[PDB]
Amino acid sequence: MLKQVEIFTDGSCLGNPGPGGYGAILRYRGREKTFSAGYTRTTNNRMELMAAIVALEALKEHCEVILSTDSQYVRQGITQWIHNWKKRGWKTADKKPVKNVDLWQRLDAALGQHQIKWEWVKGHAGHPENERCHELARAAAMNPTLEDTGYQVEV
């Protein structure tokens, strides 16, 4: 409903696993809000997911969202993976929980509350806002404050 929320996201992690951070910009109404935070031990995939999640959760009103992100990971999950996962109860073929299910479920939840349009960005030139989320992410990764609880060498 809500006029037209514009969301930008990016995540960055210094090792696999390693320190990581996310950067998200929300242009909700004439305003702009910035979200950023760093984790001591996580992965790039997790930070790319977290980014979309934090931004979407900030919205308490059913909105018309335009989310811009360059993650192939988020792209594959939204365009191909998720409906097939739900159907299989979120398990791969060998009956194990899909990797990062904790995060995919959290994203799926927020996904249902809005009219989302996904803009798959190629890569930074011409996209200043994603360049900035990347700076924010890189920066948070340099000063991790939180722990990535759902992270697991296991699954």
From Swiss-Prot:
Q: What is the effect of changing N130A?
A: Reduces activity
Which residues participate in Mg(2+) 2 binding? D10, H134
Cofactor stoichiometry and binding? Binds 1 Mg(2+) ion per subunit in the absence of substrate. Requires millimolar levels of Mg(2+) for maximal activity. Has low activity at micromolar concentrations of Mn(2+) and is inhibited at higher Mn(2+) levels. Can bind a second metal ion at a regulatory site, or after substrate binding.
What are the protein's GO molecular function terms? Answer: endonuclease activity; magnesium ion binding; nucleic acid binding; RNA-DNA hybrid ribonuclease activity
Q: Which reaction does it catalyse?
A: Endonucleolytic cleavage to 5'-phosphomonoester
Positions binding Mg(2+) 1 in this chain are D10, E48, D70
Q: Which terms does the UniProt entry file under GO BP?
A: DNA replication, removal of RNA primer
Q: Name one GO cellular component term.
A: cytoplasm
Q: Where is the RNase H type-1 domain?
A: 1-142
Query: Which positions carry the signal peptide feature in this UniProt record?
Result: none
Subunit architecture: Monomer.
Family (UniProt): Belongs to the RNase H family.
Protein name stated in the entry? Ribonuclease HI
Naturally occurring in which organism (per UniProt) = Escherichia coli (strain K12)
Q: Organism classification, top ranks?
A: Bacteria, Pseudomonadati, Pseudomonadota, Gammaproteobacteria, Enterobacterales
